[PDB]
Design a protein around this nucleic acid. Structure first.
Ligand SMILES: */O=C1\[N]C([N])=NC2=C1N=[C]N2[C]1[C][C]([O])[C]([C]OP([O])(=O)OP([O])(=O)C(F)(F)P([O])([O])=O)O1
Ligand code: NA
Ligand code: NA
Length: 321
DNA sequence: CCGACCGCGCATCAGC
DNA sequence: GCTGATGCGC
DNA sequence: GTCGG
């Protein structure tokens, strides 16, 4: 939190690029930037200092200098008071409104949530569901509600076919104390890369125990919707839940992948070169000395995959970067 | 100077 | 009605 | 906006 005033400044700037300017790369520059700065362990004293870091450059080093000397960014203040632009930026928080719809809406004077409630005839399904839950969807998820949720997802999934195999990945599988959503990955033997309605029946069971309350999108391998835990007391906030059906020969590659960590899984691609392997969500192999990657291996355990790329076991629970 | 910067499932929209 | 494109979430 | 060829 040493340079929190700085990283907030860049995260603000990042959001406006994505949401108003629609400059996705500029958005990511500021993110990268606000990330490395959020790990620098000294109170940054100048833009020059900062520019020593990777992904801070000139325009940002001068935005820090102005920040450190005056406490503000004139472009930031001006944009915060700009009605059009602030309202665009805001609406995008509603799930299913990205930069495009938020722009369209603010053109026709729909600039607040209250306005979104006045005009359902204009929101697609996903966006209504987003509107309805806008508050809950910004809450985080205690680890203990996740285990309460995990115990439900595993119970029903098994109660529909004991030969299912399902894991809850994300920051929750890394031991963390809170989660944003819940990401479940699902497999069944009767379906490999060369291969029924395996995902639908799992969704239908969790609607039948009334665990899943809405659907944002559903297909034959991905489901994105809404769940909630039961209850005398106050009802729990409705949560985001995603279910992905993966093949068996690729499950543990995607489990590994979606478990992470983010900061970690990519460290194995600067290390998928000294052992020289192609590690993506599905497949894996060695590469050619001058080119093409081979024909993917077998996988059956998780860390069969760090065997193949010279590392020992690594349980998710005990490491980040 | 000058292009790269992640790419994949699903819902929904142009454009036939 | 079909298909390729674009928006969205992540 | 920053990096790297
Ligand atoms: O743009 C992305 N591209 C990509 N190939 N993968 C990806 C992108 N965003 C996220 N992800 C991966 C990694 C991530 O772990 C999962 C699911 O996204 P989620 O659930 O929103 O992130 P997370 O790690 O679980 C979290 F944000 F830390 P949470 O949910 O605990 O707050 O897919
Ligand atoms: Na730099
Ligand atoms: Na949104």
């Amino acid at each position: 939190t040493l340079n929190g005033g700085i990283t907030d400044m860049l995260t603000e700037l990042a959001n406006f690029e994505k949401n108003v300017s629609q400059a996705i790369h500029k958005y990511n520059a500021y993110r990268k930037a606000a990330s490395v700065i959020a790990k620098y362990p000294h109170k940054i004293k100048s833009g020059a200092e900062a520019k020593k870091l990777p992904g801070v450059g000139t325009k940002i080093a001068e935005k820090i200098d102005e920040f450190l000397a005056t406490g503000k960014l004139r472009k930031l203040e001006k944009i915060r008071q700009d009605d059009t632009s602030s309202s665009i930026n805001f609406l995008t928080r509603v799930s299913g409104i990205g930069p495009s719809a938020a722009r369209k809406f603010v053109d026709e004077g729909i600039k607040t949530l209250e306005d979104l409630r006045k005009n359902e005839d204009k929101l697609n399904h996903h966006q209504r569901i987003g509107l309805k839950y806008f508050g809950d969807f910004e809450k985080r998820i205690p680890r203990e509600e996740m285990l309460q949720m995990q115990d439900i997802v595993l119970n029903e999934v098994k109660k529909v076919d004991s030969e299912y195999i399902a894991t809850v990945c994300g920051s929750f599988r890394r031991g963390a104390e809170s989660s944003g959503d819940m990401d479940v990955l699902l497999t069944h033997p009767s379906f490999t890369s060369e291969s029924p309605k395996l995902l639908h029946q799992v969704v239908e069971q969790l609607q039948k125990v009334h665990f899943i309350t809405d659907t944002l999108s559903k297909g034959e391998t991905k489901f994105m919707g809404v769940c909630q835990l039961p209850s005398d007391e106050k009802e729990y906030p409705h949560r985001r839940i995603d279910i992905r059906l993966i093949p068996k020969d690729q499950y543990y590659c995607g489990v590994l992948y979606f478990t992470g960590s983010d900061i970690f899984n990519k460290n194995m691609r600067a290390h998928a070169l000294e052992m020289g392997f192609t590690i993506n969500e599905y497949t894996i192999r060695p590469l050619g000395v001058t080119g093409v990657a081979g024909e993917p291996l077998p996988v059956d355990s998780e860390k069969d995959i760090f065997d193949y790329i010279q590392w020992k076991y690594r349980e998710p629970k005990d490491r980040s970067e």
